[PDB]
Amino acid sequence: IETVPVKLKPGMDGPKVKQWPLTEEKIKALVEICTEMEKEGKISKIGPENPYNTPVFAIKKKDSTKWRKLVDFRELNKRTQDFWEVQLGIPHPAGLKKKKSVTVLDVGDAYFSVPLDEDFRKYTAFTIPSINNETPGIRYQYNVLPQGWKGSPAIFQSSMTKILEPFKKQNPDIVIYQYMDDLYVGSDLEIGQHRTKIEELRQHLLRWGLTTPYELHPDKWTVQPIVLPEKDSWTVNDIQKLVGKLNWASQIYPGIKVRQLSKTKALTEVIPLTEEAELELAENREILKEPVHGVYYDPSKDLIAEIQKQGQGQWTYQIYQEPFKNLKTGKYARMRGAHTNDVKQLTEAVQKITTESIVIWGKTPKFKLPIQKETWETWWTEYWQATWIPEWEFVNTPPLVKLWYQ
Amino acid sequence: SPIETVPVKLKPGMDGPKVKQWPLTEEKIKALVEICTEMEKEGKISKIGPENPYNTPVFAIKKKDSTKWRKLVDFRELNKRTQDFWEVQLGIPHPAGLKKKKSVTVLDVGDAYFSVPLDEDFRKYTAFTIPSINNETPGIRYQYNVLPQGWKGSPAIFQSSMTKILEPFAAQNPDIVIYQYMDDLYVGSDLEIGQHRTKIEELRQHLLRWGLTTPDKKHQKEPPFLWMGYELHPDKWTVQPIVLPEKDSWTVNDIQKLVGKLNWASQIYPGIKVRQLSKLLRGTKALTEVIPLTEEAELELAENREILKEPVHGVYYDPSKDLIAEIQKQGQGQWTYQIYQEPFKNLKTGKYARMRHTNDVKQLTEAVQKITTESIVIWGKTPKFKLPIQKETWETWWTEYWQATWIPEWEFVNTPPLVKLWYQLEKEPIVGAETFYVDGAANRETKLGKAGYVTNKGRQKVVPLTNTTNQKTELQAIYLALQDSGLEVNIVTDSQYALGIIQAQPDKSESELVNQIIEQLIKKEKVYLAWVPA
Ligand SMILES: N#Cc1ccc2c(Oc3ccc(OS(=O)(=O)F)cc3OCCn3ccc(=O)[nH]c3=O)cccc2c1
């Protein structure tokens, strides 16, 4: 099979990203994985004439007791795919977000059966690192379509469309969308009917040579409503926090009636709700009930996700592209009795938000994560169960607005 | 020389060097021809002249004299034009991470670059010229067959070549560990000394069969080894002796160098401080201006002079015995730590300083993070921690902090100064306590301002302020309300800045006002701060 030629964006040079230091455990797992890969043709050792590099990591995908290699191809994706969303794009179905159940099948192993353009392999270099700078580091490049690269499913989509065509014929109501290594498969069936259909698709893929080794429900109540507290008795400081919350929402919603509620008592003194005050409160709860105006998804600008830690395992998030023009807000919360911690919750939340973002727009967002950069860079792999990796950056000034999104 | 070459191409769309050969003395020309025929005799440079349009300058000099001159080539114009390579050793192994071997040998490899071949189709770009008498007579033209001295590709290609030559001997000798550095090999083994020396001779012979020469005498001086500013003894490591100078005046350069040597020493000497001594550097980047030493910095320099008077050593790493790090607070944002496996000899030491209103527990957490990173680099695992903080203190801080934080396996140590939380604001307002509606304001131009309060009981104060800012007066209003209230007080400000600073629960600051506010918040019993729009 001939190779699809890959000529990346003019003037752009290849990735030159440093490799993170790793635990001995993970270095050993990487050496094992890569020795089998070299033995099978998928990667080859390289020399000093190849200056590029692309980070690698060891994770455990889908709660397995066996390791898995994860290549961070973000830099190479920006440097090639920004002309391979154009030349070889995969169109994103606008109806996948509307099916009542959506399952995510991993179909990554597929790419390993297709060779990669020889002139391109240089740019898939990666270093398995040594401890204490003791040995040079082991240098590989790919000879087959690598998982994690956005060009692989692009190149493979002709094959994927052909393999899937008999199923798509037998099931014309089902939606199938390929994001990098996963088919997202949506249906309006009962959950058991849906599971039956998903296993039929598994066996259809299998009897065509695609090995494949947890459902979403995107009737998920898009941008969530904020509610004012409801109380039998209203104190001075209750009126104060209510006023302050309602003034912050003047940035998102325009028509919050304020003055009737703004009219040197002690904080704990209970002030009775005026007729004009309860009038303004009702008008404001109503003007909050409805969704926002002018909020439309622009497909030229990037998506932005912000997360806030709420305590007791709760986390709120907003996804937007213009401030206060939220495209989607929601709330994540880990298991009630499970042994979890902050960074575990942050990682599962980032993953959940990214999957939602794929289902809805076919793009991932850039995260503004509430966490020390070096902490995240050290611990994010320990719970990362996904094969893609979103862009991110770190917040260090806190929201003195914390409750306003709870 | 039977070594497989590495293919090298030029940066895309460039030609080779066509530089001028600015002639020099005839005696230099004679010395150059002597060394050039002696280097051709060994096939390192072959002489082909006619159809090569490329040229690179050549100079001659004597530095370390065996009664002989030496030839060198300014390869700048060629280096600028050749492709990038895989970089280099990107840093140094730390001695604390080495594992003791019963023997180690150092092997300096000889004319390393000149005994590794250069890719054939690239050799034309190394071409250079010798003139006779200022272009009155033509000169002789050469090119290189081997890695030229100081060319961009020589180090990484020599590393790759040496690694490949080593791996056959490495595979017929799994009991032996070979480490590479720019020109050296370090060979360690737990073989009996006679066997270790037989293997070192076998390795030398192996390398000789590939063109690489090696010290034929007794090998590089026995331990201790003076390597990369370290001293490596068969059972310990330390830094090479660090001598701080005593002088009257100090330029910014001299304090830069003193701060540097102190940081270097801090990896094994426990207790070194650099806070008040580099507070001098932040002023500007002017190189030769003389800086007056402060009194704090003078005590700091003396204090380091003392803790540096007696030598200290570190041990090497035992992978069978677990890894421990223990942390201590020092002072003005300064922390130290020790990493050990046993109680009388550290693997290494170190210090953490704060960069930027700060908090002790958050600072400890950043120290744990710096150490965790270093541990993963040096040894490939993370230490178990010994921290001067209590599980309830820390559990309280991280359950309330706005960032996520990873709190590794840690055990509490009761060495003072303990790390604690000194005050905690109320979550809900306080019944029975006075309420202070505080505000403050300055003027951007006149730098005059006011701070004041009105309380629900009818109490009112206004105090004037000179040389202040809106934020300074905003905090001064809160300070007034704390000064003039009882042990329970509700305070109401319209200053996001103020509420942010104070809600951060800082412990100290480089701002005396916030320190007085902190001492009040410690003195008070229940304080509920609250915010309203301006
Ligand atoms: N010039 C120079 C120089 C010399 C030697 C170096 C060096 O030796 C070693 C090589 C492999 C080793 O094996 S390993 O890392 O466990 F796999 C362990 C090693 O020396 C660590 C323990 N040590 C050290 C000295 C000693 O006398 N006695 C002893 O015990 C390592 C790095 C840099 C070196 C630089």
Curated annotation (Swiss-Prot), chain B:
Changing residue 183 to E: Strongly decreased RNA-directed and DNA-directed DNA polymerase activities. No effect on RNase H activity. The record marks 436-437 as: Cleavage. A motif (Tryptophan repeat motif) lies at residues 394-410. Changing residue 165 to T: 34% increase of DNA-directed DNA polymerase activity. 18% increase of RNA-directed DNA polymerase activity. Changing residue 185 to I: 29% loss of DNA-directed DNA polymerase activity. 46% loss of RNA-directed DNA polymerase activity. Changing residue 224 to A: No effect on RNA-dependent DNA polymerase activity. Complete loss of RNA 5'-end cleavage. No effect on RNA 3'-end cleavage. Changing residue 63 to R: 10-fold decreased sensitivity to ddATP and ddCTP inhibitors. The record marks 397, 410 as: Essential for RT p66/p51 heterodimerization. Changing residue 262 to S: 17% loss of polymerase activity. 30% loss of RNase H activity. Changing residue 185 to R: 20% loss of DNA-directed DNA polymerase activity. 21% loss of RNA-directed DNA polymerase activity. It is found in: Virion. Changing residue 187 to A: 37% increase of DNA-directed DNA polymerase activity. No loss of RNA-directed DNA polymerase activity. Changing residue 165 to V: 70% loss of DNA-directed DNA polymerase activity. 64% loss of RNA-directed DNA polymerase activity. Changing residue 50 to G: 74% loss of polymerase activity. 86% loss of RNase H activity. Changing residue 410 to L: Almost complete loss of RT p66/p51 heterodimerization. Mg(2+) 1 binds at residues 108, 183-184. Changing residue 231 to A: Complete loss of RNA-dependent DNA polymerase activity. Complete loss of RNA 5'-end and 3'-end cleavages. Heterodimer of p66 RT and p51 RT (RT p66/p51). Heterodimerization of RT is essential for DNA polymerase activity. The overall folding of the subdomains is similar in p66 RT and p51 RT but the spatial arrangements of the subdomains are dramatically different. This is Reverse transcriptase/ribonuclease H. It comes from Human immunodeficiency virus type 1 group M subtype B (isolate BH10). The chain holds residues 602 to 1137 of 1447 of the full protein.
